[PDB]
Structure formats: C-alpha cells, structure tokens
Amino acid sequence: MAQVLIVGAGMTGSLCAALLRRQTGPLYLAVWDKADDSGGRMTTACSPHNPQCTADLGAQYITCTPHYAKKHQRFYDELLAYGVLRPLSSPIEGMVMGDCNFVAPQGISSIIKHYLKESGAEVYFRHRVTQINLRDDKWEVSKQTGSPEQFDLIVLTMPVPEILQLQGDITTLISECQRQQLEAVSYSSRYALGLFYEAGTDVPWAGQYITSNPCIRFVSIDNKKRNIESSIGPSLVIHTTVPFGVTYLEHSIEDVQELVFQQLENILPGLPQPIATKCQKWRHSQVTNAAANCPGQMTLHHKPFLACGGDGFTQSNFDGCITSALCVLEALKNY
Ligand SMILES: Cc1cc2nc3c(=O)[nH]c(=O)nc-3n(C[C@H](O)[C@H](O)[C@H](O)COP(=O)(O)OP(=O)(O)OC[C@H]3O[C@@H](n4cnc5c(N)ncnc54)[C@H](O)[C@@H]3O)c2cc1C
C-alpha cells in the first residue's frame, strides 16, 4: 500500500532501497534518476566499439579503514561473497596507508546495480524531479516530462545544491536554520577523461597520483587496476585537478578534451591515438568543507515523510554513503 520514492540511482539511493526491502513489507519501491543509466559519481563508461572495454569515470577504488571494518563488516563481506568486490592486487604510485584496498572487477557501477536488483525496486531513467508539492497529506512529485506522481515517503540522495534547485512546497518545508546549514555544504569540481584502445601496452604501475602537474591529478589503467587478463583493449582514466575543474566548468567539452589530451603527452609520451573518448564533467565532485553539523541525514517533514541523504551529510567515500543510508533508515523506522 505504501508508495516510497528514492530520488537518485547512486550509491546512497541504491543502498537505501536495498536496506528498505529488509526490516519491513508490503511496499511499492520506485527509484528515479535524471541520467540514462545508474551509478551517479560511481559510473562506468563503456566503449562504443565493445561493451567489454570499460572505464570508471568517477570513483576508482574502495579504501577500507580499520575503523569502518568491523563497523560496516556485514556490507563488505556481502560484496566479497558475491564477487562484486575483490582486493586490489595491482600497483598504484603515490598512495598513502592498516588500510585495505578493494576493486570492482566488472566496473565500479556494478555495486549500485547489485543493490538495485536486491531491492526489486522499479527503476526509471531520464526522470528529473522538478517539483515536490503537498496535496491531501501525500506528495505530488512533478518531472521534466510528463505527468506527476503520488507517494507516501520520499528520500532525496542528490548533492545538496541540487536539492535546493527544486521548486514547490519543499522550498517552504525547509526552515531558515536548515536552509543555512544546507547552504554551508560545498563540493569541489573536476573533469574526467575516459580513453579507449584496442592497441595494448606501457608502465609498471596501474594507477598514479600526480601533485606536480597543473592540469592532471590522477591517471589509471582501468583494465590493469581491475586485473582483466583477457586479450579487450586497454582503458585510460584521467582525473583533473580542482583549479582546472573550476576554471573550465562553463567551457566547451571539445575544448577541455584538447587541454587534457595535450597534457597527457607531457606525463606519458609514446601512446597511440585512442579509438574512443568520453569526457565527464563532475560539477559536484567531492564534499570539501560541508556537513553542516556532521549528521547522516536531514528530515524535513514527518507525516508524510521526506528526508535528504547522501555525501553532503557524511564524507565523499563508500563508507560515508553507507553511514548516510543507515541514518535515513533509522529515521523512517517508526513510519
Ligand atoms: C572524480 C571523483 C573521484 C572519486 N573517487 C572516489 C574513490 O576513489 N573512492 C570513493 O569511495 N569515493 C570516491 N568518489 C565519490 C563517490 O563516488 C561518491 O561519494 C558517491 O558516488 C556518492 O554517491 P551519492 O549517492 O551520495 O550521490 P550521487 O552518486 O551523486 O547520486 C545522485 C544521483 O541523483 C541523480 N539526480 C540528481 N538530481 C536529480 C533529480 N532532480 N531527479 C532525478 N535524479 C536526480 C544524479 O544524476 C545522480 O545519479 C569520487 C567522486 C568523483 C566525482
């Protein structure tokens, strides 16, 4: 009977959906995302030439600190039993460490896809929430196209400035103090460049952190990082710096691509011309100085229920999303 809407098919949202399926039903689970596919900042791009040639444009690997294991032990052991995650066994230059690194052999977006199927939720793509209105002690959720929809509960997982862009009753359900806390939330900006080959080969490492370059911050050989043996072609992922990301936010994607491509020649000369390229703009890459109080979630209405979750309330990492999802679930436990 209960109609629950989860806005955002990212890390926080897919886990909220999977956790809601447990500890209940009966309920109807809907997941809406403005993008063509799921993942959010954990997406994996695939080559047009071959769907097997894959590159992680956002998150690279899962860093497990000795605190969040055994705190999130149940989450890690489940993702390892299914083979979704596997320990990192390839070298990555410039990394700092009793930590343990993990990689997703089928691409980092496979984690979200696993949680979405576990939830049994009805997932709808190219579904951008425009307005959230209150009609007869129930929610009326509007989209870019077409007709609006009714729900009993809503969980919002998109970056904080995007929650603030929504029009309707939501703008008046947010108290002045809550609005000030949300406005304090800040994200850095970066550009991602995915390059696809069929060539092969190289360098000894699989990943490399760069601090001396004005445009590039990190370079990864995605196939070697995930340790794909098969002879599929190599895949290169480049993460820009924050100053480059902020300077070129409103610039042409084809112009930005040429800046990073000419910068890759200085870091790594002797590479063939790529078959395919994928440039991804991360306007809200990672949470810088934002909380605003440290809490996992923010409830803005109880009957009917509405909360905001995600990165902006914890930290911009896999365990931050887990803590934010667990906090949202404890908030709706008696609803
Ligand atoms: C370059 C980069 C490197 C990173 N590296 C790491 C790493 O190595 N390890 C690590 O742990 N983490 C890393 N992260 C961060 C990690 O990817 C995130 O912390 C995690 O993705 C947070 O997901 P989320 O669910 O909170 O939000 P998101 O993944 O942002 O999900 C929000 C979703 O909501 C959708 N959406 C937004 N508005 C609407 C709307 N109006 N209607 C419908 N849908 C909407 C968006 O399209 C998006 O899919 C990195 C991120 C970036 C950008």
Side-chain angles (χ1 to χ4, degrees):
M1 190 178 74
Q3 316 293 281
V4 182
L5 173 65
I6 292 167
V7 184
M11 184 49 210
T12 310
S14 57
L15 188 54
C16 273
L19 284 167
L20 254 161
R21 190 80 267 177
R22 285 163 46 90
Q23 297 293 318
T24 49
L27 47 81
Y28 168 73
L29 257 165
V31 181
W32 285 13
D33 202 293
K34 70 193 214 64
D36 316 293
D37 196 34
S38 54
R41 282 171 272 156
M42 258 161 72
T43 63
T44 296
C46 107
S47 162
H49 220 235
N50 191 29
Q52 295 292 319
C53 190
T54 254
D56 294 308
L57 305 165
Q60 297 302 301
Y61 51 91
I62 289 100
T63 173
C64 186
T65 63
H67 177 261
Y68 279 126
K70 61 183 181 179
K71 217 241 204 148
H72 295 157
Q73 198 192 282
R74 136 242 249 189
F75 297 89
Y76 278 98
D77 294 294
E78 185 248 26
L79 289 184
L80 290 163
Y82 283 100
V84 176
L85 285 180
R86 159 212 290 179
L88 173 69
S89 62
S90 215
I92 185 273
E93 287 195 345
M95 176 63 172
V96 289
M97 294 278 269
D99 282 24
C100 189
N101 299 100
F102 304 91
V103 289
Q106 219 174 83
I108 227 90
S109 92
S110 306
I111 298 165
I112 289 120
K113 291 187 205 286
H114 160 261
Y115 286 129
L116 286 178
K117 83 127 113 77
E118 208 161 78
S119 74
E122 304 255 33
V123 204
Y124 303 88
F125 298 113
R126 290 173 209 167
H127 262 229
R128 198 195 83 177
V129 172
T130 298
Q131 290 200 245
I132 295 151
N133 299 299
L134 189 64
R135 313 265 142 90
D136 326 293
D137 300 334
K138 282 178 181 81
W139 303 113
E140 213 65 47
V141 191
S142 308
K143 309 172 294 203
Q144 191 159 66
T145 186
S147 60
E149 287 208 294
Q150 233 181 52
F151 298 98
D152 296 289
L153 294 92
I154 308 171
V155 171
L156 302 174
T157 61
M158 63 249 222
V160 171
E162 283 158 357
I163 296 168
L164 300 167
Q165 268 168 244
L166 302 167
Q167 288 141 333
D169 294 324
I170 188 177
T171 75
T172 55
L173 293 162
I174 304 157
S175 71
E176 309 185 320
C177 64
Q178 280 174 132
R179 190 165 286 273
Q180 287 185 297
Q181 287 176 74
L182 295 163
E183 277 178 271
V185 177
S186 57
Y187 299 74
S188 68
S189 296
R190 285 184 154 92
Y191 266 107
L193 229 327
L195 312 168
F196 309 100
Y197 302 94
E198 215 133 68
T201 67
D202 60 344
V203 243
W205 49 262
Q208 166 152 243
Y209 279 109
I210 313 112
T211 44
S212 65
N213 197 90
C215 306
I216 300 165
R217 184 62 172 97
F218 162 82
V219 178
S220 189
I221 307 141
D222 215 89
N223 45 289
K224 295 290 177 182
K225 182 194 84 187
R226 298 177 292 134
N227 190 41
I228 315 289
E229 258 118 357
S230 190
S231 59
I232 323 158
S235 207
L236 223 139
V237 176
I238 301 140
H239 276 174
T240 66
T241 200
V242 174
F244 186 95
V246 182
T247 299
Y248 295 94
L249 266 180
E250 272 129 287
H251 274 255
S252 146
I253 297 160
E254 292 235 66
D255 173 62
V256 171
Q257 207 177 250
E258 299 317 287
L259 269 128
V260 182
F261 200 77
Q262 205 189 324
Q263 199 52 249
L264 190 281
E265 97 184 69
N266 288 119
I267 275 176
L268 277 155
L271 270 79
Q273 210 173 340
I275 287 149
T277 61
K278 178 92 194 280
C279 193
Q280 174 64 39
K281 187 199 288 197
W282 298 125
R283 193 166 219 112
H284 314 284
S285 78
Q286 25 240 128
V287 193
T288 53
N289 32 59
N293 271 18
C294 226
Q297 62 79 51
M298 189 193 285
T299 26
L300 62 97
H301 212 74
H302 295 91
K303 202 231 281 162
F305 195 94
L306 177 49
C308 314
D311 236 30
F313 300 92
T314 54
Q315 320 126 62
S316 6
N317 68 346
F318 167 84
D319 293 288
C321 301
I322 295 177
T323 30
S324 189
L326 291 169
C327 277
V328 167
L329 209 85
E330 194 159 282
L332 47 86
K333 164 208 261 69
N334 296 324
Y335 295 98

